[PDB]
Amino acid sequence: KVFGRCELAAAMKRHGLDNYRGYSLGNWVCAAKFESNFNTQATNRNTDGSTDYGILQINSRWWCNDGRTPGSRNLCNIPCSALLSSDITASVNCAKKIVSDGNGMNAWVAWRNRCKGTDVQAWIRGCRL
């Protein structure tokens, strides 16, 4: 599913991401924009052989099982394919674990490079939330 911007904002808000670990909703929407362009089906191979999955491009070395990433830990206890669903619940639940891991949203290199320190509230501007 390719979410609309406000559509994803609403879903993320309903699933409790607004201000989760202190990160306002615009941060999450901005991260998803640059990670996946709001496409739940997005996948991208990394150099180490892991792959990133879904709206928040969650990696198979640490977080989900894809069966092809040696030394994988599956900390979210989910198949990586669950992160491609039109239903973002699994991505949200796993994102909540990731952002709690110590480095906050710096875990998402796209967020640090493209969202951090910017006017992220612009990403929820115009939405009825």
From Swiss-Prot:
Residues 1-129 form the C-type lysozyme domain. It catalyses: Hydrolysis of (1->4)-beta-linkages between N-acetylmuramic acid and N-acetyl-D-glucosamine residues in a peptidoglycan and between N-acetyl-D-glucosamine residues in chitodextrins. SUPFAM superfamilies: Lysozyme-like. In the egg white and polymorphonuclear leukocytes. Substrate binds at D101. CDD domains: LYZ_C. Its EC number is 3.2.1.17. Lysozymes have primarily a bacteriolytic function; those in tissues and body fluids are associated with the monocyte-macrophage system and enhance the activity of immunoagents. Has bacteriolytic activity against M.luteus. This is Lysozyme C. It comes from Gallus gallus.
